[PDB]
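User: Is it possible to get a 3D structure for a protein together with its bound compound? The compound here is manganese (II) ion. I've pasted both below.
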Amino acid sequence: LITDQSREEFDILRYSTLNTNAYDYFGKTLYVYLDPAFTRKASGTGVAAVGAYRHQFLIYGLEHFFLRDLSESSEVAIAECAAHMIISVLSLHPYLDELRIAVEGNTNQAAAVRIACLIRQSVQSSTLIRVLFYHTPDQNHIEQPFYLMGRDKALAVEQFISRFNSGYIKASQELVSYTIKLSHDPIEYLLEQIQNLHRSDDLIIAVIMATYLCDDIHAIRFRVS
Ligand SMILES: CN(Cc1ccc(F)cc1)C(=O)CC(=O)C(=O)O
Ligand SMILES: [Mn+2]
Ligand SMILES: [Mn+2]
Ligand SMILES: [Mn+2]
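Assistant: Yes, that's possible. Here is the predicted structure of the complex:
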């Protein structure tokens, strides 16, 4: 259960990240979590781009979208959508010099590795940046660029609820979203998913997980793909 004050302050108090006199105030690494679409009913693809300000977090980008055809063409669509958001966030924040991405590979491990590669090729065509992916060892023990969700989801949700209520999770006032803002405010949209958090959710799961993978404890899992 999320406090009404935290919801109110999340809406009215946002980080002004474009003052050139304040570029050296923020963390220089962008953490991205991607939750791909999974179908009786179909879920969408959730993407969140978070960063650090001291011991707090700020959301830079959010993407939530549903596909019309889910046969390999969707992999290109998911990757391009995520890459477009990342490129725009990096264009506005020149202080970001590292990119740490986690692609959820629970639904399909092979498709997750394909998406990771597609994002890496798009981002590297557009900008010169260090790109690291979360690596998990597969059935054959070879490290692959995907994240596997399990029991730790309970820990990540718990951690989030405590940080959110303390006001340690804030939005950027130059928050990038190409998929949302379609008769919405991206924050008001995210807040609706926050109010339904229990003990569609793809966007809040991406926010919870991106802020969870910020920890030093996970740093060793991020490698060049
Ligand atoms: C079923 N899984 C994979 C999963 C498996 C085990 C686990 F602990 C956590 C996640 C989904 O990711 C579903 C989803 O996004 C959705 O319905 O929007
Ligand atoms: Mn408002
Ligand atoms: Mn998922
Ligand atoms: Mn999902």
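The pocket of manganese (II) ion (ligand 4) is lined by residues 35, 38, 43, 46, 202, 205 (CB under 6 Å). The chain has one domain: 1-225.
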